[PDB]
């Protein structure tokens, strides 16, 4: 008869120290009765939140997952769980009379996380170009993709998860791919389209606390 929303109590959500904004928002969950522990109820919750809401003056077409791993008091401590491009940005990316190049790699972080990296790029038409189509030959696409794989993995396997996140928040990788690929075929709208988690390193509580601390 009585509603259970009285039995639901609210918590707050806290971001890792990669970002200048710390509070994502608020959740709700039932109280802990019997075997139903509210702590494990909050764990495993992902929060698709805009990067612009995480930073101060960055772009709003990126989104982070930020799954929770530890809860203490009214704080749900989250860690980076994946990044993706917004649907309207991806749809605007695809144009006719050009070539799309996609690459997917598996990179193991020095910290221990396993990451599947998705990166997309598009060919570019020059300012003085008169030809309607800017197409790249198959070997050019293959060399662009091979360069994309190699200089994506060479900077991500060389540093821990913390350094990976703080370097993809402006997508400095996409700028490096874009700069390196110009000698083969110029590209303009190069971004790391997506990145997802595959393995997690045994859930060290101290690593989360230092990631939210000093």
């Amino acid at each position: 008869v009585v509603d259970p929303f009285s039995k639901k109590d609210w918590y707050d959500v806290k971001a890792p120290a990669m970002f200048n904004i710390r509070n994502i928002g608020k959740t709700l969950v039932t109280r802990t009765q019997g075997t139903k522990i509210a702590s494990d109820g909050l764990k495993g919750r992902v929060f698709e939140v805009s990067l612009a809401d995480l930073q101060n003056d960055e772009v709003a077409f990126r989104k982070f997952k930020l799954i929770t791993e530890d809860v203490q008091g009214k704080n749900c401590l989250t860690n980076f769980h994946g990044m993706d491009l917004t649907r309207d940005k991806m749809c605007s990316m695809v144009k006719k009379w050009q070539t799309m190049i996609e690459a997917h790699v598996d990179v193991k972080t020095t910290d221990g996380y396993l990451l599947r990296l998705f990166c997309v790029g598009f060919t570019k038409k020059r300012n003085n170009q008169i030809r309607k189509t800017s197409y790249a030959q198959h070997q050019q696409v293959r060399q662009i993709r091979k360069k994309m794989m190699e200089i994506m993995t060479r900077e991500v396997q060389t540093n821990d998860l913390k350094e990976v996140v703080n370097k993809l928040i402006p997508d400095s990788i996409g700028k490096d791919i874009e700069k390196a690929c110009q000698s083969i075929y110029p590209l303009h709208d190069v971004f790391v389209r997506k990145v997802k988690m595959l393995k997690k390193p045994k859930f060290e509580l101290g690593k989360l606390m230092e990631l939210h601390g000093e």
Binding site: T86, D88, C91, S92, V94
Partner: protein, 102 residues
């Protein structure tokens, strides 16, 4: 009486083209034959763009766009008035119709 030189499809050097499904009736239509209308719609209609912008917490937000590419069989295209019958001479003009933007 061959009505069209291209037989109503853009296939010149191919033998076979994989089909698609009409987004209105799910007719199996060859891809090079179907009518492709790639629409860029506003997420919110022009009557409610004000109400969403007023209620937006952000001081300056840009309403997104729906990017849907639509594939039509010629029967659904004609029934939905996407394409119309034309004269014998008018059928040979391949320029897209004007947008009438001003």
């Amino acid at each position: 009486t061959k009505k069209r030189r291209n037989n109503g499809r853009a296939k010149k050097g191919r033998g076979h083209v994989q089909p698609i499904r009409c987004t209105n009736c799910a007719r199996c239509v060859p891809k090079d034959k179907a009518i492709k209308k790639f629409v860029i719609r506003n997420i919110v209609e022009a009557a409610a763009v004000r109400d969403i912008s007023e209620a937006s917490v952000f001081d300056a937000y840009v309403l997104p766009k729906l990017y849907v590419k639509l594939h039509y069989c010629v029967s659904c295209a004609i029934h939905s008035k996407v394409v119309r019958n034309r004269s014998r001479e008018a059928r040979k003009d391949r320029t897209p119709p004007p947008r009438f933007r001003p």
